[PDB]
């Protein structure tokens, strides 16, 4: 996951310019508001959700927290629940026959 997200961020957003969410940025202008990064991260999460590995999606959306670094600048603070998938290891079943 770290490899894929590092590749995505280093390729899709080089030399961009972040801005506050209410900014009136043009369609083609290189601006990434926190909302834009949030939607891109959700789309990427789906991109590695089709191919498993992240199971749930809703809790990821609610717990995703992308914010501008209020202190200093040029840093998106991103806090995301990993929501990693689990492997089918142990099967426990009680029959409770009814006769």
């Amino acid at each position: 996951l770290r490899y894929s997200l590092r590749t995505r961020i280093t390729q899709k957003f080089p030399n961009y310019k972040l801005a506050s969410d209410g900014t009136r940025f043009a369609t083609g202008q290189a601006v990434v508001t926190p909302s834009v990064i949030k939607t891109e991260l959700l789309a990427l999460f789906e991109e590695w959700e089709n191919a498993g590995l992240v199971e749930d999606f809703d809790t990821f959306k609610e717990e995703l927290y992308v914010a501008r670094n209020k202190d200093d600048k040029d840093r998106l603070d991103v806090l995301c629940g990993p929501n990693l998938i689990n492997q089918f290891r142990i099967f426990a079943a009680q029959v409770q026959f009814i006769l």
Binding site: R2, L5, N15, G22, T23, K73, R75, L79
Partner: protein
């Protein structure tokens, strides 16, 4: 946008009447039973007073209720110029009906109250009062503008607090 509408109404009244009306002045509050002994009436003059606003159609517009309190003098139980005051009332209604004034549009006449009781008859003042309602919108959300060079993307995976931390400090725009 209310103060702009109020200024537009005042400017329209000034343009329409000019020197016929001695003065025009926004009036704080609605006309109470003490305003006659409190204001600098200087009749004949008209006062524009905001009477609030009821709910509009949408969540971004309201029905603002304004009022035009017209003043004059009634020396010896006789209006100073009855044709003058009647003409003032009618012209104020005509010029401030339907026409827009700033953001507010669709000024509709609602009531023309006589509003001339003892407190004003004994003070030598007639107080014909017009009321208006208008579809006035609410101000939009204040825009923003800022450009900071995107250079660093700090991501932290939300493991338990004392679980060893997992994070990525991408630091984009780095070349090697």
């Amino acid at each position: 946008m209310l103060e702009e509408t109020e200024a537009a109404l005042l400017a329209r009244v000034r343009e329409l009447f000019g020197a016929t009306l001695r003065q025009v002045e926004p009036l704080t509050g609605t006309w109470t039973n003490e305003d006659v002994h409190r204001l600098f009436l200087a009749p004949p003059s008209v006062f524009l007073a905001w009477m609030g606003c009821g709910e509009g159609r949408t969540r971004r517009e309201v029905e603002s209720r304004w009022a035009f309190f017209v003043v004059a003098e009634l020396l010896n139980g006789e209006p100073v110029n009855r044709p003058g005051i009647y003409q003032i009332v009618e012209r104020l209604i005509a010029g401030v009906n339907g026409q827009t004034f700033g953001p507010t549009t669709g000024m509709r006449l609602t009531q023309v109250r006589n509003l001339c009781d003892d407190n004003r008859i004994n003070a030598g003042v007639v107080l014909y009062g017009v009321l208006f309602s208008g579809t006035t919108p609410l101000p939009s959300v204040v825009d923003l503008d800022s450009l900071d060079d995107y250079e660093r993307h700090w991501q932290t995976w939300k493991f338990p607090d004392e679980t060893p931390e997992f994070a990525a400090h991408i630091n984009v725009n780095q070349e090697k």
